[PDB]
Amino acid sequence: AQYEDGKQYTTLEKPVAGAPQVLEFFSFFCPHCYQFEEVLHISDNVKKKLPEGVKMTKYHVNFMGGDLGKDLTQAWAVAMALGVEDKVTVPLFEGVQKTQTIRSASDIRDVFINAGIKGEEYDAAWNSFVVKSLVAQQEKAAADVQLRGVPAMFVNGKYQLNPQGMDTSNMDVFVQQYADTVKYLSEK
Numbered sequence: 001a002q003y004e005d006g007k008q009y010t011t012l013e014k015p016v017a018g019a020p021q022v023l024e025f026f027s028f029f030c031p032h033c034y035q036f037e038e039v040l041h042i043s044d045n046v047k048k049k050l051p052e053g054v055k056m057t058k059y060h061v062n063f064m065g066g067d068l069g070k071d072l073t074q075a076w077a078v079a080m081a082l083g084v085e086d087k088v089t090v091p092l093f094e095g096v097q098k099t100q101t102i103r104s105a106s107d108i109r110d111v112f113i114n115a116g117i118k119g120e121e122y123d124a125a126w127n128s129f130v131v132k133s134l135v136a137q138q139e140k141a142a143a144d145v146q147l148r149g150v151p152a153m154f155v156n157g158k159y160q161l162n163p164q165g166m167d168t169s170n171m172d173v174f175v176q177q178y179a180d181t182v183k184y185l186s187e188k
Contacts, residue, residue, distance in 0.1 A: 007165040008181040012158055016144045019157025020057035022050065022182060025142060026151045028072045028096045029065035036151045038093050040171060045179040046153075054186050058085070059138040061150055065096075071105040072096070077134035078112070078125040087115045155185035 005011055024043060026033040036042045047056050060076035062069050072092070079085045091111045095102035102108055112122045125131050141147075145154050153161040166177045 003181060003184045007162065008177065009155075009162050009165075009185060010160045012145065012154070012160060014146075016141075016154075016157035019141070019144070019154065021054045021156060022046065022056045022186065023141065023145075023154045023157075024056065024058045024151065025061050025145075025147055025153075026058065027061050027064040027069065028076075028092050028102075029069055030150050031097065033151045034093050034097045037089065040175050042151075042175060042178055045175050046182045049179050049183045051183070051186055059141050061142055061147065062139065064150075068096075068103065068105075071108055073138060074126065074131065074135055075105075075108045075112070077131045077138065078122060080134055081125050081128070081131055082117060082121065084112070084115065084117060087117075088112060091115060153182065155182060156188070159185045159188065161185075 003009070026037065043056060043058065050056065060073040062073050065072065075088075075092070076085075079088050088111055091114070092102070092108070095107065095111055102111070109119075109122055109126075113119055145152075145157075145160070155161070161178065161181060163174070163178060166181070167173050
């Protein structure tokens with residue numbers, strides 16, 4: 001058929017109960033994730049096609065970058081708690097990978113300050129149990145899908161996107177197929 005198990009996607013042998021409809025894992029330390037988000041714009045192209053009543057969820061991972069990697073997971077939890085994901089995603093990617101001016105937790109906080117988040121609000125979120133729970137939630141999600149690498153995307157807790165089985169030629173053909181595959185899976 002057009003979409004095939006083992007080609008554009010694979011199937012989790014242990015489906016995850018109560019998973020987000022569309023779940024992406026990434027790291028701000030991850031060069032392929034920089035390409036995915038900031039060059040290919042995969043998440044944006046995916047959302048542009050999703051059926052309505054279907055939302056996209058994005059979680060950070062700890063396993064790249066040591067202390068700073070975990071700080072970034074905690075900052076992403078802050079972004080989710082404050083609802084400022086779309087304001088910090090680009091400057092966090094650029095601070096870690098382009099400028100490489102993000103080398104400490106304080107450097108992450110500066111990005112939020114500069115994007116208009118008040119300091120007291122950032123600090124209250126950073127230190128909150130609501131954020132500690134959000135960090136745990138991201139970690140648990142990674143365990144549930146038995147995550148092995150990033151970037152990664154899972155649909156309805158059952159299907160895993162397999163970009164290795166898509167076309168690499170035209171970046172845009174690649175991106176369109178990826179996005180088309182997510183849409184197909186969402187209705188499956």
